[PDB]
Amino acid sequence: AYTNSFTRGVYYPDKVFRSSVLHS
Amino acid sequence: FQPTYGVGYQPYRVVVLSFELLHAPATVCGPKKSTNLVKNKCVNFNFNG
């Protein structure tokens, strides 16, 4: 059986605080 | 390994120290003496290196 994951399985990429920014 | 072996064939003990300079909280430091913390002035600082 199956389902669509939608927009999940994202984790914080590194242990640095950031705010009010778009990071690639 | 035998005591008669040449300088290239003799055993050597080896250690590799693998450092992790991660952006995480540090837990292994060199012997550096800490100070009191100064605020609102311009200062030189050293936080965990």
From Swiss-Prot, chain A:
Attaches the virion to the cell membrane by interacting with host receptor, initiating the infection. The major receptor is host ACE2. When S2/S2' has been cleaved, binding to the receptor triggers direct fusion at the cell membrane. When S2/S2' has not been cleaved, binding to the receptor results in internalization of the virus by endocytosis using host TFRC and GRM2 and leading to fusion of the virion membrane with the host endosomal membrane. Alternatively, may use NRP1/NRP2 and integrin as entry receptors. Binds to host ACE2. RBD also interacts with the N-linked glycan on 'Asn-90' of ACE2. Cleavage of S generates a polybasic C-terminal sequence on S1 that binds to host Neuropilin-1 (NRP1) and Neuropilin-2 (NRP2) receptors. Interacts with host integrin alpha-5/beta-1 (ITGA5:ITGB1) and with ACE2 in complex with integrin alpha-5/beta-1 (ITGA5:ITGB1). May interact via cytoplasmic c-terminus with M protein. May interact (via N-terminus) with host bilirubin and biliverdin, thereby preventing antibody binding to the SARS-CoV-2 spike NTD via an allosteric mechanism. This is Spike protein S1. It comes from Severe acute respiratory syndrome coronavirus 2 (2019-nCoV). The chain holds residues 27 to 50 of 1273 of the full protein.
Swiss-Prot record, chain B:
Residues 23-45 are annotated as: Disordered. It comes from the Viruses. Attaches the virion to the cell membrane by interacting with host receptor, initiating the infection. The major receptor is host ACE2. When S2/S2' has been cleaved, binding to the receptor triggers direct fusion at the cell membrane. When S2/S2' has not been cleaved, binding to the receptor results in internalization of the virus by endocytosis using host TFRC and GRM2 and leading to fusion of the virion membrane with the host endosomal membrane. Alternatively, may use NRP1/NRP2 and integrin as entry receptors. Binds to host ACE2. RBD also interacts with the N-linked glycan on 'Asn-90' of ACE2. Cleavage of S generates a polybasic C-terminal sequence on S1 that binds to host Neuropilin-1 (NRP1) and Neuropilin-2 (NRP2) receptors. Interacts with host integrin alpha-5/beta-1 (ITGA5:ITGB1) and with ACE2 in complex with integrin alpha-5/beta-1 (ITGA5:ITGB1). May interact via cytoplasmic c-terminus with M protein. May interact (via N-terminus) with host bilirubin and biliverdin, thereby preventing antibody binding to the SARS-CoV-2 spike NTD via an allosteric mechanism. This is Spike protein S1. It comes from Severe acute respiratory syndrome coronavirus 2. The lineage of its organism: Viruses, Riboviria, Orthornavirae, Pisuviricota, Pisoniviricetes.
